[PDB]
């Protein structure tokens, strides 16, 4: 429809109406497929992700870290923004949870998932980069934070960049998007003391070699 792949895979509120395909031969976007990332930032290795998803033999979505039970020590309800409005309400990406301090603290976070069901699993997450130290105190409490993510083939420590940036969609900060494929039999872990947006949903899949993407208003 009117969404591009980043919008669709992250869960832009306006892509909620799209159905989920179990398989597909190619991807079709219109020249007007403007609904992508709604909270401005760098979508990393976007082109490689688009290629991997271009032709899929099997695809299913599953909740990975249940919204209500995975983070009893963090606030999963205040993580909304005017940058991703839904029917006038502040909202956020459907496949992600933006965790913020509960009360007046942000206890160290440690979570994992084991992919013991047999398909490759695509996990996406993001990192928040506040414009000011005043936001860091409002959202994460901890002034000096880090984020770490890993799997048998992935390891990266991230650090937030607090800076005033030009406003984009009225935001003075940015949120970056990262992703990786967890092989069957492997484990993915997350650790943070702040600034981490955690996956809520993840996808299981099998790639059908690869095709292509058509940008067109020609009807299906």
């Amino acid at each position, epitope marked *: 429809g009117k969404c591009n792949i980043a919008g669709w895979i992250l869960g832009n509120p306006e892509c909620e109406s799209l159905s989920t395909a179990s398989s597909w031969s190619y991807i079709v976007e219109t020249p007007s497929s403007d609904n992508g990332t709604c909270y401005p930032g760098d979508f990393i290795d976007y082109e490689e992700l688009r290629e991997q998803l271009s032709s899929v033999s099997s695809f299913e*979505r599953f909740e990975i870290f249940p919204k209500t039970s995975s983070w009893p020590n963090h606030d999963s309800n205040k993580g909304v923004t005017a940058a991703c409005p839904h029917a006038g309400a502040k909202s956020f990406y459907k496949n992600l949870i933006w965790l913020v301090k509960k009360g007046n603290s942000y206890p160290k976070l440690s979570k994992s998932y084991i992919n013991d*069901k047999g398909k490759e699993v695509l996990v996406l997450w993001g990192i928040h980069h506040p414009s000011t130290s005043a936001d860091q105190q409002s959202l994460y409490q901890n002034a000096d934070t880090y984020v770490f993510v890993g799997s048998s083939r992935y390891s990266k420590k991230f650090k937030p960049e607090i800076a005033i940036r030009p406003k984009v969609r009225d935001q003075e900060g940015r949120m970056n998007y990262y992703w990786t494929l967890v092989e069957p039999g492997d484990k993915i872990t997350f650790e943070a003391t702040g600034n981490l947006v955690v996956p809520r949903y993840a996808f299981a899949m099998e790639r059908n070699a690869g095709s292509g993407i058509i940008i067109s208003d020609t009807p299906v």
Partner: antibody, heavy 120, light 107 residues
Framework: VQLLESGGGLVQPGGSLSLSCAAS????????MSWVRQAPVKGLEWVSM????????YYADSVKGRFTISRDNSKSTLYLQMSSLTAEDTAVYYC???????????????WGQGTLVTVS | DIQMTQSPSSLSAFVGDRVTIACQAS??????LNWYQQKPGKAPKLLIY???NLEAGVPSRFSGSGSGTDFTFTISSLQPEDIATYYC?????????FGGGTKVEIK
């Protein structure tokens, strides 16, 4: 969320009874759905399941070849066609949300409160 | 098919006593379990998922553990609110199968 079963009642053996389940509070079209059977003797049995897009189904061997499972996402509704009914199919039937779209990954988190189907 | 065996089928204890049940798989199912609580007149409520992850809204009394073919469930110190039939369920493969149900009475 809510899942509300509809249809049920007392019928004679043979013939059929149609059940349906109305979904609310969630994007129905994003999830796979299933039916569970609660017999008075066998505590919990299972009947059938359908993928989120309706592309695939899976049936208990005990109902396979008789029952038909289908859905219409535009109406947020799940259907079960309980054809060729017998006395052994008397049970309370429940509809449930699997919290996945493809059967293989998932959790049957939310069940409706069910309906009673009696065959005699 | 993988059939769960649940034991005891009936359990009773007084309030404050420690209550545990056990359930076994006929095949190694890793940790693919869902424990349910069925209060009379209600659809069963999921209490524990992926064998040991306590579900939201379920009090700390409840806990699960185990792997492979032998799993357990505890409700710690038993309270009157816990009268229910508890059920095993696993989702290792298809069909998903249930255990027989353990009736827990309090007195």
């Amino acid at each position: 969320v809510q899942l509300l079963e509809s249809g049920g009642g007392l019928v004679q053996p043979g013939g059929s009874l149609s059940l349906s389940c109305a979904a609310s509070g969630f994007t129905f079209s994003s999830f796979a759905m299933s039916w569970v059977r609660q017999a008075p003797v066998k505590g919990l049995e299972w009947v059938s399941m359908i993928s989120a897009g309706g592309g695939n189904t899976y049936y208990a061997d005990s109902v396979k070849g008789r029952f038909t499972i289908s859905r219409d996402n535009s109406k947020s509704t799940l259907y079960l066609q309980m054809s060729s009914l017998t006395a052994e199919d008397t049970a309370v039937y429940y509809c449930a949300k699997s919290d996945s779209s493809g059967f293989q990954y998932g959790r049957r988190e939310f069940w409706g409160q069910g309906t009673l189907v009696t065959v005699s | 098919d993988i059939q769960m065996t649940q034991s005891p089928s009936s359990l009773s204890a007084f309030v404050g006593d420690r209550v545990t049940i056990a359930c076994q798989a006929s095949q190694d199912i890793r940790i693919h379990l869902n424990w349910y609580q069925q209060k009379p007149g209600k659809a069963p409520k999921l209490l524990i998922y992926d064998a040991s992850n306590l579900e939201a809204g379920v009090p700390s009394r409840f806990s699960g553990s185990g792997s492979g073919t032998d799993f357990t469930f505890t409700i710690s110190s038993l309270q009157p609110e816990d009268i229910a039939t508890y059920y095993c369920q696993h989702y290792h493969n298809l069909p998903r199968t249930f255990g027989g149900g353990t009736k827990v009475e309090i007195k």
